[PDB]
Design a protein around this ligand. Structure first.
Ligand SMILES: CC[C@H](C)CNC(=O)C[C@H](O)[C@H](CC(C)C)NC(=O)[C@H](CCCCNC(=S)NC)NC(=O)[C@H](Cc1ccccc1)NS(=O)(=O)N(C)C
Length: 330
């Protein structure tokens, strides 16, 4: 079996993408944030504290005939940006672009943090990192991909995210019409439970490729590109008006500038992010100052190949016994 779903940015700055998911019987469609950086599928529902509910679409376990409460299981998670959620768990049928998994754990939120209540276009998260990061207790619940693996035509899923446009998530197949060149595969360490890999170096604009190991994670749930502070500094050094702002939280630049591209190595291959994808957007509507999409990972503690990187390539999360990650130019 296979599945294909279109995914869309929740705003005009590509802060996140949501993909529709059908949960329960008859199907309840929710729009979730497909996150390769977590392993929890949870959604807002009939159980979340009302005043914690904005205009999100909720899951009502009670209206689904295949739902089953998972006796005694609870969950609690906190994310990298401080948000958090917790609740209980049900198992139900979950479909993604025609790809159905029965008995998938759907974690029902009882409480959500303020950033989630305020983001009206995200109904929950669908985690895609290793099941070892799952927060359900006492027994960890497998991700949608671990559960679909038996059925998949090939154990893989690809991310094809768009720059200010829709994209696609596909499961169990590789669409050769979607990228150019061939796919370069790189080893993944699962020690931390993440889609963790090592980049071979970088290049700023039309300058030299520097061979330096960049250990990082590929995470569709992270907006920007977090690199070591000395690589970020070499990028911004090429942009005349750019500077580091303590008030805004990072490098800012005149919106007016044409920024250089940024290339990161994948083995022998190079993936070129267009200077424009690095222009995240102005600080505030009308400002002459814009937010840089390449930020320092000094304060996070790990490098993150988030959305600004991920959208410049065709990405293959190959979930075979020995997982690997493939990158293609598109
Ligand atoms: C078991 C716990 C596991 C390890 C949790 N994994 C994780 O926590 C990684 C996972 O991908 C989350 C998903 C996110 C939707 C809440 N990413 C994040 O938490 C990041 C943080 C990236 C690193 C930032 N950390 C720091 S200290 N920066 C100074 N958020 C993001 O990148 C959000 C994503 C987002 C956007 C819009 C709506 C919802 C969520 N964009 S952002 O807020 O940082 N951007 C607006 C500035």
């Amino acid at each position: 079996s296979t599945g294909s779903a279109t995914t869309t940015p929740i705003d005009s700055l590509d802060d996140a993408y949501i993909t529709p998911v059908q949960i329960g019987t008859p199907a309840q469609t929710l729009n979730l944030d497909f996150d390769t950086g977590s392993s929890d599928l949870w959604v807002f529902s009939s159980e979340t504290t009302a005043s914690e509910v904005d205009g999100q679409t909720i899951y009502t376990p009670s209206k689904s005939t295949t739902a089953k409460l998972l006796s005694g299981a609870t969950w609690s998670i906190s994310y990298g940006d401080g948000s958090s959620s917790s609740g209980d768990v049900y198992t139900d049928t979950v479909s993604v672009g025609g790809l159905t998994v029965t008995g998938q754990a759907v974690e029902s939120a009882k409480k959500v943090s303020s950033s989630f209540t305020e983001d009206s276009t995200i109904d929950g998260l669908l985690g895609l990192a290793f099941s070892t990061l799952n927060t359900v207790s006492p027994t960890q619940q497998k991700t949608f991909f671990d559960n679909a693996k038996a059925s998949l035509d090939s154990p893989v899923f690809t991310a094809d995210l768009g720059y200010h446009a829709p994209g696609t998530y596909n499961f169990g197949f590789i669409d050769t019409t979607a990228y150019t060149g061939s796919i370069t595969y790189t080893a993944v360490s699962t020690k931390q439970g993440f889609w963790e890999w090592t980049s071979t170096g970088y290049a700023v604009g039309s300058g030299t490729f520097k061979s330096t190991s960049i250990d990082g994670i590929a995470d569709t749930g992270t907006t920007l590109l977090y690199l070591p502070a000395t690589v970020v500094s070499a990028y911004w050094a090429q942009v005349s008006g750019a500077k580091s702002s303590s008030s805004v939280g990072g490098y800012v630049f005149p919106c007016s500038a044409t920024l250089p591209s940024f290339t990161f190595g994948v083995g022998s291959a190079r993936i070129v992010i267009p200077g424009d994808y690095i222009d995240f957007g102005p600080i505030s509507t009308g400002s002459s100052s814009c937010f840089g999409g390449i930020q320092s990972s000094a304060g996070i503690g790990i490098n993150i190949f988030g959305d600004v990187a991920l959208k410049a390539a065709f990405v293959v999360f190959n979930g075979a016994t020995t997982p690997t990650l493939g990158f293609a130019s598109k």
